Homo-oligomer: A and B are copies of this chain.
Amino acid sequence: TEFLKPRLVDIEQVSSTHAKVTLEPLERGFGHTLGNALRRILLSSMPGCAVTEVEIDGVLHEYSTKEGVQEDILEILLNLKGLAVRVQGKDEVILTLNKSGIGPVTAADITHDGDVEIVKPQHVICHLTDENASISMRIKVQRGRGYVPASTRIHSEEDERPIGRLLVDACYSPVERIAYNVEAARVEQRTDLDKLVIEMETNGTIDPEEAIRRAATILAEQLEAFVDLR
């Protein structure tokens, strides 16, 4: 046993969305061992927030069209899937949005709750054409992980909701893309060591470093079973 642990070195957050993370020194072969295993976890397991339900007044169903609004209701819902939200405290929040007039409605127009940060305020939601048009909605954002579509929910959800309330496919997972490169790290004696460079592209918020911590934690939890139970 010549145990050798890596240490988190550089976190070059090129953008809030895109971040490079170098990591060294790793003993030979562990670059790819750890690189791939983490990548798998990062893509799926990663928990996040997403719009689960929607309620717009004067809207019975998603296939209808609202007057004074360019986008049909489905188009609006698509944009809401894309809406990047960080909820700090609670796991479930219901944000309100009442906007009027001749305006491309953006995320900023949503009334932000004390502990709810809208990561991309400029994110388009709806386009109000008629000035006398006023849109008013309530968007439920929950915390989950992976991808839970509305079709999954309706199947298990024998719990009836009121008509009016529109369920949305929840894309909880924040990690948009991930890749890891392995270069050689050079020590005085050991030139066979390697550095791992993880390039992550995530939606809003979920902090590169924090996501790394969590992903490693999930993997270690699994390893408990193979160590502790035999």
Residue numbers of A with Cβ under 8 A of B are: 1-3, 5-8, 11, 23, 26-30, 32-34, 36-38, 40-41, 44-45, 47, 145, 214, 218-219, 221-226, 229-230
B222 and A8 form a contact (CB under 8 A): no
B33 and A229 form a contact (CB under 8 A): no
**Nearest CB of chain B from residue A147's CB, rounded to whole Å:** 11
B5 and A224 form a contact (CB under 8 A): yes
Using Cβ atoms and an 8 Å threshold, which residues of chain B touch A222?
5-6, 26, 30, 34
The residue in chain B whose Cβ has the minimal distance to the Cβ of A26 is B222
A33 and B41 form a contact (CB under 8 A): yes
A8 and B230 form a contact (CB under 8 A): yes
What copy number does this chain have within its complex?
Answer: 2
New contact pairs (12) apart from A5-B221, A32-B40, CB-CB < 8 Å: A2-B47, A5-B222, A8-B230, A11-B230, A30-B45, A30-B222, A33-B37, A33-B40, A33-B41, A34-B37, A34-B223, A37-B37
A1 and B44 form a contact (CB under 8 A): no
A8 and B44 form a contact (CB under 8 A): no
A36 and B36 form a contact (CB under 8 A): yes
Q: Which of B29, B40, B214 contacts A40 (CB 8 A)?
A: B29
The residue in chain B whose Cβ has the minimal distance to the Cβ of A33 is B40
Using Cβ atoms and an 8 Å threshold, which residues of chain B touch A8?
225-226, 229-230
Contacts known (A34-B37, A37-B37, A40-B33); A221 close to B11, Cβ less than 8 A? no
**19 pairs across A/B with beta carbons < 8 Å?**
A1-B47, A1-B145, A1-B214, A2-B47, A3-B218, A7-B225, A8-B225, A8-B226, A8-B230, A29-B40, A29-B45, A30-B40, A32-B40, A33-B37, A33-B41, A33-B219, A34-B37, A34-B222, A38-B226
Using Cβ atoms and an 8 Å threshold, which residues of chain B touch A145?
1
**Nearest CB of chain B from residue A205's CB, rounded to whole Å:** 16
Using Cβ atoms and an 8 Å threshold, which residues of chain B touch A218?
1, 3
B221 and A3 form a contact (CB under 8 A): yes
**Nearest CB of chain B from residue A44's CB, rounded to whole Å:** 5
Using Cβ atoms and an 8 Å threshold, which residues of chain B touch A34?
37, 219, 222-223
A7 and B230 form a contact (CB under 8 A): no
| Cα–Cα, bound, A1→B10 (Å) | 27
